[PDB]
Amino acid sequence: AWELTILHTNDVHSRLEQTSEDSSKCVDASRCMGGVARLFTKVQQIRRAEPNVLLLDAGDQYQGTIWFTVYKGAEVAHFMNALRYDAMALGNHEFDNGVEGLIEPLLKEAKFPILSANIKAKGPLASQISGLYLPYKVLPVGDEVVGIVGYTSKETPFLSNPGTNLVFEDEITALQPEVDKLKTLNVNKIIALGHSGFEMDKLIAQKVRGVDVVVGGHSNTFLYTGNPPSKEVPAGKYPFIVTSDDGRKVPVVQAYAFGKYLGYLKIEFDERGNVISSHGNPILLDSSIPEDPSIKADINKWRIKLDDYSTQELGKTIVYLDGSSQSCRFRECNMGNLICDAMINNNLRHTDEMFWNHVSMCILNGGGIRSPIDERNDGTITWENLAAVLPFGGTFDLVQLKGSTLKKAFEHSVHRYGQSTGEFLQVGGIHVVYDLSRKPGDRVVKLDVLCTKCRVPSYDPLKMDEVYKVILPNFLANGGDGFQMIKDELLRHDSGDQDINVVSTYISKMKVIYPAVEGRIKFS
Amino acid sequence: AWELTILHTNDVHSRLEQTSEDSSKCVDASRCMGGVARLFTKVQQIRRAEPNVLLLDAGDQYQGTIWFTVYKGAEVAHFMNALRYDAMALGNHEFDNGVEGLIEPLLKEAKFPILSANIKAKGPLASQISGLYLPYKVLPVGDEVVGIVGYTSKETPFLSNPGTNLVFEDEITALQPEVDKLKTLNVNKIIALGHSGFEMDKLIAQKVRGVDVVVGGHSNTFLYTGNPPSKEVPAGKYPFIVTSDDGRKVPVVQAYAFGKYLGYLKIEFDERGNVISSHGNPILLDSSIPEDPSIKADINKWRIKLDDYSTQELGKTIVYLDGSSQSCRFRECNMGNLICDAMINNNLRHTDEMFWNHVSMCILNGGGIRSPIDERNDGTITWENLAAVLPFGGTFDLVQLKGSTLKKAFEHSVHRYGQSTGEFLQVGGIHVVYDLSRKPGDRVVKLDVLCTKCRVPSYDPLKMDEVYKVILPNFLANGGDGFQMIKDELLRHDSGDQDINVVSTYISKMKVIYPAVEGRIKFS
Numbered sequence A, B: 001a002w003e004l005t006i007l008h009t010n011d012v013h014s015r016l017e018q019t020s021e022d023s024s025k026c027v028d029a030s031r032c033m034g035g036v037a038r039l040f041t042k043v044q045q046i047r048r049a050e051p052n053v054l055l056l057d058a059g060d061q062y063q064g065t066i067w068f069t070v071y072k073g074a075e076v077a078h079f080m081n082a083l084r085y086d087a088m089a090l091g092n093h094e095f096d097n098g099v100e101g102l103i104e105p106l107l108k109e110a111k112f113p114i115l116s117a118n119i120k121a122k123g124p125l126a127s128q129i130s131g132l133y134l135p136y137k138v139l140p141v142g143d144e145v146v147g148i149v150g151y152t153s154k155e156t157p158f159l160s161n162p163g164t165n166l167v168f169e170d171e172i173t174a175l176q177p178e179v180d181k182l183k184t185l186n187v188n189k190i191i192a193l194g195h196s197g198f199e200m201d202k203l204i205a206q207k208v209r210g211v212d213v214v215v216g217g218h219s220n221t222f223l224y225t226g227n228p229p230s231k232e233v234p235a236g237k238y239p240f241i242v243t244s245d246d247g248r249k250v251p252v253v254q255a256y257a258f259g260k261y262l263g264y265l266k267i268e269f270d271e272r273g274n275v276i277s278s279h280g281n282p283i284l285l286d287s288s289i290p291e292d293p294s295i296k297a298d299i300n301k302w303r304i305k306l307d308d309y310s311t312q313e314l315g316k317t318i319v320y321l322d323g324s325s326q327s328c329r330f331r332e333c334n335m336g337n338l339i340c341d342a343m344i345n346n347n348l349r350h351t352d353e354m355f356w357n358h359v360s361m362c363i364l365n366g367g368g369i370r371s372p373i374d375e376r377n378d379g380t381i382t383w384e385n386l387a388a389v390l391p392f393g394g395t396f397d398l399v400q401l402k403g404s405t406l407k408k409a410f411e412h413s414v415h416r417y418g419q420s421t422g423e424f425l426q427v428g429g430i431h432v433v434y435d436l437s438r439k440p441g442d443r444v445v446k447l448d449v450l451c452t453k454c455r456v457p458s459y460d461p462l463k464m465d466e467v468y469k470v471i472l473p474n475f476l477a478n479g480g481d482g483f484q485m486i487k488d489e490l491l492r493h494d495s496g497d498q499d500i501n502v503v504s505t506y507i508s509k510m511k512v513i514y515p516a517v518e519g520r521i522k523f524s
């Protein structure tokens, strides 16, 4: 009975330090979770009990908190070396700072293999990057060998900044030949480790012959078998079992995000690489598991550089600024309302006497709100708090749109509602009412907008023919999140201030904030 | 043909200077209206054409602008003397500063008779005030005599500060004997000049025998015959004709408010005091009528004391702050939301950790918003502008009421909707929906309120059993405007800051304001 124990994180997103249960900054240490020091402790506990253990990361360590803004990746390489990871697949956000943002910080410093089989470099890059990332890696595990093939999101050119000298092929098309090569090398146990979302994960397990396990990410999927230990709601059992086209039962696993859970899968292999059985569950890394002192001290040695971003208090908040995905991708959220009001507050300028201000409206992709902010620490908001909410460093731009163009974006906002996708829109100066029973593209039942050509701002139904000015993220003006209609049909695009400075300025102007949910978005 | 011309103002409310068409502070002088200097000119033009002319005031010169805050009445005595008024009835706001606030400034300095027949003093006051105001006055007009009887609102003890040494009798009960007294003195032409509202004016004209004309006020009633000259909508023809119980046609007149119009009524009397005919109309005092230089110079001589209230700029506004009665007494108006938003912003104090703040709601009687604020002066907001919006100097108190108490107050808010009454409520942290088709007391179809025991403020239907904290004017906690349920059923009443300082502070904190109409109040 050859047993393998796969440990896997994904979408850790720079939460090196322990976090609150909402993955925001750790306020009350007696209830905090995650961290790489607590992960070390738990990983060790298992490497002692089990002889055959592999530790894998399925992408998206980059971006999320002030840890990445400063060290820009070097912190990721250091503490993944300290955790002695056995392999890592590349995610889209690993290209957030371009290829150069990945080679010098991460690739050149990792002491473990970094994998991606559907990325191929060309031109000046093929010599600069050759050998720094592999399509697969055959790892020794005891007296056997396990092959691990990497894959990265086909859509990463649209999601990030890979550059024009990197081609991203269809995952299944590129993975299949690499798996066949490993089989011809007499490797009968093969793991697919990648970053394309749960739905592609299930397709890779169904169509790629010879994949025994798929360990994925990118969709922050929580799977659990039984009664779950925390707030996260499971999308299915752990592992999710896929029956391949050639007749095999192929487990598919993922461990949410933000370092909260450690995926734990046990696989019973026969002598020929057949999977007899698979069982496990993600392990909640709560306060019961102590942080390893040696890693924690190295954390604090690196933590002294970051305390320069929590020195200055920008303002206070007396409400919970709910920027969780469970809210801002499903309903109106007060962090969404906060961010939009500050966007409108920044574009206030004198104009014609037949107007009160040139722009009265705001839209904001919920997926762009990347973290909540707790108020129980005497409500203080520092730059560190804001850098977790708006980590990407985009801008807040002025656009101009036709009533019909806006109507299509709000139909798109809910065209696949229910899957926790980022395109759900938070709004300002807009009152939208949805009806999901109606068919996609015909679910905006009401859409009223705040008038600009009026001495008293008031709400008036959207007119398709009219033309409106909107403050939106740079991410959306360029067609992000599937908002092609915006990128195509806009009548004007003026660039604006930094998204983090716009929100830093408006919180100091107000000194104390209490944004509410007031019906800007409603459901029939 | 003995003809009499009655000129009458009413509810001037301290608008000594010329004003904007909304009666707010005069921005662009080439379009401004009213003023005592422009009234003078028009009065003169008529005294030259007609030999028999009476100029009357039907009450409520006190309170309304910074002129009254500073000079406290002396400006009324002075500039009513300079226009040589022939008589003045006492209004409710004439007692806003108590009896002594009426005796020393106006009564002792008026060179015209000040009339009120239904007010009788008692105790220590009856010798201090005897002869400073009369129930009637028989004035010579050419070779005839006209009797003028004063009356003041029966409700003045609830509306103002008359004191316990003044009794207010039923108008009709008190006027009849005085009118009978004048008849026995062979006075066959008798005018009723008083301050009880258009509805009582019509009743005084119907039930008091021997009254030939009723010249009233207090309800800012606009009457016009034909096509009106400005925004004001007429409530009826000018004069409104009442058929008395004893068979006479009795004209009843009123001239809006704020000095915008000069009432102009011509009456044809026969030899025995019968009314042969009555016709006229209010005269719009617009820019075509020049301001009298001599009054304007005396106006400017007095204006130097007041310019210390426009020196300091508290903030700016880029929207029209609509504090007009036609908006703020019928529908949501953005001046109401502003005042309520500042009330909630002021009662922010740390509380139990299972709350975001103790108070989330606000109610505000629309009639307490006493002036709009124009923004075309590059929107500067000074103290002078605010003292016109909140002239009374009340406070904003914290009260505690049962859901049923509040449900009753909002049924009262619209229980006689449509007559421009002050009890219509402006709100904050509350979403109310009315249905006027339904019967009074059964017109609040929806009532949602902003939660306090919640880390994310959101709106939840009113629960009758629950208990809520509300910020409301001191005027409402005490049962004003007919909100008895609050005074009776409140579980707590703590006094707060000045109504004018709360709104001055919140306008500086924000630096630039743009309050909108956002659906806090809606109509089925």
Ligand SMILES: CCCN(Cc1ccccc1)c1nc(Cl)nc2c1ncn2[C@@H]1O[C@H](COP(=O)(O)CP(=O)(O)O)[C@@H](O)[C@H]1O
Binding pocket: A011, A060, A092, A093, A096, A158, A159, A160, A161, A218, A219, A220, A365, A366, A367, A368, A392, A393, A394, A395, A421, A422, A423, A473, A474, A475, A476, A481
């Ligand atoms: C200046 C733009 C800055 N960037 C990134 C970037 C950098 C460099 C070049 C291009 C783009 C972003 N700007 C905004 Cl405004 N929203 C974003 C951005 N990137 C992700 N989201 C949202 O996130 C959702 C997925 O979140 P997720 O947790 O489900 C899976 P992910 O971990 O792979 O992202 C999506 O549905 C989005 O709504």
Ligand SMILES: CCCN(Cc1ccccc1)c1nc(Cl)nc2c1ncn2[C@@H]1O[C@H](COP(=O)(O)CP(=O)(O)O)[C@@H](O)[C@H]1O
Binding pocket: B011, B060, B092, B093, B096, B158, B159, B160, B161, B218, B219, B220, B365, B366, B367, B368, B369, B392, B393, B394, B395, B421, B422, B423, B473, B474, B475, B481
């Ligand atoms: C500290 C309280 C200060 N006072 C007056 C006062 C002074 C001294 C002692 C007691 C009371 C008021 N406070 C407020 Cl907050 N609103 C008020 C007050 N008095 C009238 N309104 C409103 O005005 C409406 C009528 O307006 P109207 O112009 O149509 C006819 P009016 O000229 O005779 O009043 C009414 O329906 C109300 O809603």
Ligand SMILES: [Zn+2]
Binding pocket: A011, A013, A060, A218, A257
């Ligand atoms: Zn991610």
Ligand SMILES: [Zn+2]
Binding pocket: A060, A091, A092, A093, A195, A218, A219
């Ligand atoms: Zn991703």
Ligand SMILES: [Zn+2]
Binding pocket: B011, B013, B060, B218
């Ligand atoms: Zn009045």
Ligand SMILES: [Zn+2]
Binding pocket: B060, B091, B092, B093, B195, B218, B219
């Ligand atoms: Zn009055």
